[PDB]
Design a protein around this ligand. Structure first.
Ligand SMILES: [Cl-]
Ligand SMILES: [Cl-]
Ligand SMILES: [Mg+2]
Ligand SMILES: [Mg+2]
Ligand SMILES: [Mg+2]
Ligand SMILES: [Mg+2]
Lengths: 197, 188, 171, 106, 96, 134
RNA sequence: UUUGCUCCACACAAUAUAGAUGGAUACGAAUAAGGCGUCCUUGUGGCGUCGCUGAACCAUAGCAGGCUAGCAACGGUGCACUUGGCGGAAAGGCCUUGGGUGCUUGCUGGCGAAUUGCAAUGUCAUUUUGCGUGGGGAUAAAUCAUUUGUAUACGACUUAGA
RNA sequence: AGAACUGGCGAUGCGGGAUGAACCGAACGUAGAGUUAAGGUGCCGGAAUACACGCUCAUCAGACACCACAAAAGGUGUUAGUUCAUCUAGACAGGAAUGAACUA
RNA sequence: GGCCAGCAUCAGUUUUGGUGGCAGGAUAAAUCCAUAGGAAUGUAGCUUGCCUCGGUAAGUAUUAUAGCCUGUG
């Protein structure tokens, strides 16, 4: 319903989230994905690392610059999973892919906005308890991602500022809540209660 | 077969206090404190009284139930680690070349050195983990004693010393030379 | 499908030598009467020298559960064909009606032994009247006094694609 | 007030199609707030307009309209089928359409 | 079919492509790791290559046949007049 | 010093547990668990709300905090007497969960003229509240 | 190379839309656990309460929203200024001080609407560029040709020349 | 490579099996509406991230006829089952079930 | 009277809801009511032993200060 939907990628299964976003883009909804380094994939870490090495060895024999490109960043790994679910070789597919943005961490434009989640793709709601899963941030580092520590340091700074904002918002909400309760027991409040509001 | 309920009991002595929250276990006793993170098993801890704690699994299979008894053993080891402690004894075994073992300090790291193992000129260094103290027993020839509150720290520290003295390119049945754990017990 | 239990009574075609032949009855679990009559001739041709062309059906009646709102322990004897050989098997099912227990039996055989409907013969279904006669541990655990158990990790179904708060699995 | 909307927002998804062949004469329309075939029965027969802009002004206006209506439901998720006087262009897959409240049975 | 005899490959594949350099001044693509507990100092210097010549020195290498004996070695001379500082630049860490 | 262990507060599947049906012909009505069939099936019976005695999968209902004394396998007549004695309906109606259900139904039953009155009343209350804030 | 170039306010044209039509409404972490409120000896603390979806919350009445009178409050909100602080991951935003001015549907009044003829998006958005107004701002380089050999098949590269 | 009966391809498009002369469905004048076949309904892709009972964790899991492959022989991985013996008169290991041989 | 539309009343084909009256079966089976009998995953009562003055533990006890099962009507 929002003109732009911002999805927090933490705790989401990569494949199920990718299917949801691909349909949203084709239907005409702009999507922004943040914290791609906190994505989850079902299965043990060693299994997924072996799968990526199978992907690594595929390349054009006579020229390596022509073959498949192996992007190591967590945001580009999710982008690969999403491009495969869109007909990206058509003009309709190209237009849909321009409605999507994926970032590691939460960049300054979106750190003061609202983030939503997709229950269909949440790991805590889908995987059976006890099943092993892997985190996309550590998988990317093992295959040659260089900016894991930089994102971690910046995210720590963002949380300090975000926590300070929440403390002031909590204090103001307590003041507002008391006034609404104080404003009760009046004739206007009783009439609103009869109508459901 | 998805047993409805499986239960285990953990006993607590008088001087030991246990605090469990969100599968984080801290045990405080006369000898110190220990902490363990158990957020990988999906169990439920419940307190009966100050001397008894129960841990249970609900609707668990054969593999899940097998880990319930492991939790009890790990928590019990923490309780006795802060009450009696752990003491591991090792003995030096050699045929011809004596083994010289001494504690050295390298940039404030508290290493332990092994010299003249099978006549080797190489120096072997083993780090000493935190909470583990190393002493050389008197009136017993060629014995090293490791003590600490955590059984895993003491056991792994002793195991590192044993593996660092393995013979290569020789018949190990004939060349029975090394440092081996000889006794496992409590400090008290 | 959703099974119903029918009684089917049949006989050989009467002749001048043997007027009024003997009546044979058996209880059949089937989704409808057409299948029930087909199953009747399937088992009768394994027991007596007769077939559909030389016999007739006397009556077919549906049998209802006497107390369909009472929890009962059932013992089931079955004969089934695996990929190599034929085996006999005893299983115990807890339910409120015979048709419900038979439905679980067919699902259990398909899941654990890959046995289809055509490879299963239901020898006998009998209610276990007394406790301590239950000989399977996966049924006895539900017969303890004051049985209570929680339902950890509740998962709630969402009607919308996007949610504006992290969900909780409390129960 | 700040709102003057008298229609229900909608999206043009695609044509009626099999896996490999499409039918431009029928368009599939998604209505916001409708997620059930029973609820989609309310909008059957309602007029639908697609509003777009052009550079050239023809009849004293630079806004053009294509008219249609809802024919029947589609699937189990509240999608409906629609037919327009002139078939919608394929470039409008994902564009917005307006579903009016007339003809009314209230 | 397989080659009749084995032989090492000709050339090094890590120095590809064998194209002309972008600029006549070669880029410095790495600097020594910084140690914050030391005085501020430069990490590189600029100069112009003048030529080569020969020197004679004693060899200090125990265990060698030519230990404590003269050796003849070739050297390269780089003309290095002082450089002039004309500015500073600051860099910020980014996920990119 | 005493040992501190956090205690869970799960709702238990038990005889006498009150459940709320969300799927089926008895959706939105209360019922009581009479007996446990297996890990996923129970026998429920609510006479007050007209819920027939039936065996139902646990995924069709939601457990409630309410619980009343009831012997295992009790018949429909016995359930009615225990249900009325414990005053299950009165306790349910006082909960915030039931009031949220009642409010949701009330808003859906408002006419256009009533919605206009809600806007007017909300504006009047807003004036008083914001005045107190400042 | 005939007064060109750049910034600001609006003036008229042209151009185009992957698709405005009340509001993208900001803790973090856990999920075999948490949020909020409250008290204390400030903790892995005591007590109370909430969930079972945003089906929410905020906004929302007036010629797409006019012209006027009064009452109660000193509040709410828009625009243009102003004070101070914070934000570098792509900061280009957020918060705050002071006055001016407009509106206020918190309450009570008085006038206007028609004829678009029984519906026809019935036109109220933001993209880019061009030509004319006047209020400020700034007065260069590159290439060819020539020359060099640290370069070179030709281009290219590297040097020099008021 | 060579025969028997029938149905096909050749002489044939159309829906399905990604792709294919022969398989599955169905055979064709030009159009509209409705309903289906075989095959399908996470996304590509029209259609339930439907409901229900179980099974499976694989450091080379598996995933649909024709069809684009895997065996003998093994596993105290896990699930269900068969037969025999011990065990309320206290077995097994060092207070409740346990041991052995087999089936898939 | 040419072009494009709106509404009403009908005809042909079709799709999706609300609602009424009947028939059959063990003349549904149950629930419910009456009645006879019985059992335990044994309710009240009683007894026994340790027990922060009443909560447990196991013996008796078949409806009592809970109930349930089976047959028949
Ligand atoms: Cl090489
Ligand atoms: Cl040149
Ligand atoms: Mg690289
Ligand atoms: Mg031919
Ligand atoms: Mg194929
Ligand atoms: Mg689709």
């Amino acid at each position: 319903v929002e003109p732009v939907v911002v999805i927090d990628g933490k705790g989401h299964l990569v494949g199920r989230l990718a299917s949801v976003v691909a349909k949203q883009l084709l239907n005409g909804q702009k999507i922004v994905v943040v914290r791609a380094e906190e994505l989850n994939i079902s299965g043990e870490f060693f299994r997924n690392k072996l799968k990526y090495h199978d992907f690594l060895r595929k390349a054009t024999a006579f020229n390596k610059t022509r073959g498949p490109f192996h992007f190591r960043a967590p945001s580009r790994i999710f982008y690969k999973a999403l491009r495969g679910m869109v007909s990206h070789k058509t003009a309709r597919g190209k237009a849909a892919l321009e409605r999507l943005k994926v970032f590691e961490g939460i960049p300054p434009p979106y750190d003061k906005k609202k983030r939503v989640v997709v229950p269909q793709a949440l790991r805590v709601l889908r995987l059976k308890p006890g099943r092993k899963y892997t985190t996309l941030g550590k998988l990317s580092t093992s295959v040659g991602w260089k900016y894991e520590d930089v994102v971690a340091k910046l995210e720590a700074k963002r949380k300090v500022s975000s926590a300070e904002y929440y403390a002031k918002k909590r204090a103001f909400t307590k003041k507002v809540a008391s006034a609404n309760a104080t404003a009760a027991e009046s004739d206007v409040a009783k009439q609103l209660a009869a109508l459901g509001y | 077969m998805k047993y409805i309920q499986t239960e285990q009991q953990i006993e607590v002595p008088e001087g030991v206090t246990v605090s469990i929250k969100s599968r984080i276990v801290k045990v405080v006793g006369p000898r110190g404190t220990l902490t363990k993170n158990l957020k990988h098993i999906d169990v439920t801890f419940t307190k009966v009284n100050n001397q008894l704690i129960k841990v249970a699994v609900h609707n668990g299979g054969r593999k899940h139930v097998a880990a319930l008894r492991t939790v009890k053993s790990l928590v019990d080891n923490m309780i006795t680690g802060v009450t009696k402690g752990y003491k591991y004894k090792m003995r030096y075994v050699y045929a011809h070349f004596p083994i010289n073992v001494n504690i050295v300090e390298k940039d404030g790291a508290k290493f332990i050195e092994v010299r003249n193992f099978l006549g080797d000129k190489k120096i072997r260094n083993v780090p000493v983990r935190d909470g583990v103290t190393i002493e050389f027993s008197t009136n017993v020839k060629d014995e090293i004693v490791l003590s600490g509150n955590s059984v895993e720290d003491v056991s792994q520290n002793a195991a590192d010393l044993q593996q660092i003295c393995r013979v290569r390119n020789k018949d190990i049945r004939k060349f029975l030379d090394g440092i081996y754990v000889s006794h496992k017990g409590f400090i008290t | 499908a959703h099974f119903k239990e029918y009684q089917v009574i049949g006989r050989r075609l009467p002749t001048e030598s043997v007027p009024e032949p003997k009546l044979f009855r058996m209880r059949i679990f089937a989704s409808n009467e057409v299948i029930a009559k087909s199953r009747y001739w399937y088992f009768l041709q394994k027991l007596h020298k007769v077939k559909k062309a030389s016999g007739e059906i006397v009556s077919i009646n549906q049998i209802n559960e006497a107390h369909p709102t009472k929890v009962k322990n059932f013992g089931v004897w079955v004969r089934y064909d695996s990929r190599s050989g034929t085996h006999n098997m005893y299983k115990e099912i807890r339910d409120v009606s015979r048709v419900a227990a038979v439905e679980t039996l067919y699902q259990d055989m398909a899941a654990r032994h890959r046995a289809r409907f055509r490879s299963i013969h239901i020898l006998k279904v009998a209610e276990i009247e007394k406790t301590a006669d239950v000989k399977r541990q996966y049924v006895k655990q539900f017969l303890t006094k004051d049985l209570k158990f929680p339902l950890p990790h509740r998962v709630q179904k969402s009607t919308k694609t996007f949610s504006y708060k992290r969900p909780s699995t409390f129960y | 007030a700040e709102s003057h909307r008298l229609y229900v927002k909608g999206k043009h998804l695609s044509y009626q199609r099999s896996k490999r062949v499409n039918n431009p004469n029928v368009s599939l329309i998604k209505i916001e707030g409708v997620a059930t075939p029973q609820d989609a029965q309310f909008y059957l027969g309602k007029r639908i307009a697609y509003v777009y802009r052009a550079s050239k002004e023809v009849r004293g206006s630079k806004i053009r309209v294509m008219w249609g209506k809802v024919t029947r439901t589609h699937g189990n998720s509240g999608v409906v089928r629609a037919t327009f006087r002139n078939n919608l262009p394929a470039k409008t897959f994902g564009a917005s359409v307006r579903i009016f409240l007339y003809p009314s049975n209230i | 079919s397989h080659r009749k005899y084995e032989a090492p490959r000709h050339g090094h594949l890590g120095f590809l492509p064998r194209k002309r350099a972008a600029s006549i001044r070669a880029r410095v693509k790495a600097f020594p790791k910084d140690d914050r507990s030391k005085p501020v100092a430069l990490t590189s210097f600029l100069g112009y290559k003048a030529g080569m010549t020969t020197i004679v020195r004693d060899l200090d290498r125990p265990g060698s046949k030519f230990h404590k004996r003269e050796v003849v070695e070739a050297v390269t001379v780089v003309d290095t007049p002082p450089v002039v500082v004309v500015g500073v630049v600051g860099y910020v860490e980014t996920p990119r | 010093t005493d040992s501190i262990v956090k205690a869970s507060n799960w709702r238990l599947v038990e005889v006498g547990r009150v459940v709320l049906i969300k799927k089926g012909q008895s959706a939105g009505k209360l019922a009581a668990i009479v007996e446990i069939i297996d890990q996923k099936k129970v026998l429920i019976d609510g006479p007050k709300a007209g819920v027939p005695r039936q065996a139902i999968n646990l995924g069709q209902v939601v457990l409630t905090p309410l619980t009343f004394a009831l012997p295992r396998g009790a018949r429909t007549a016995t359930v009615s007497k225990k249900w009325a004695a414990a005053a299950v309906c009165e306790k349910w109606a006082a909960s915030s969960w039931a009031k949220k259900i009642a409010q949701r139904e009330r808003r859906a039953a408002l006419t256009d003229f009533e919605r206009f009155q809600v806007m007017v009343l909300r504006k009047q209350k807003r004036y008083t509240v914001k005045k107190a804030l400042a």
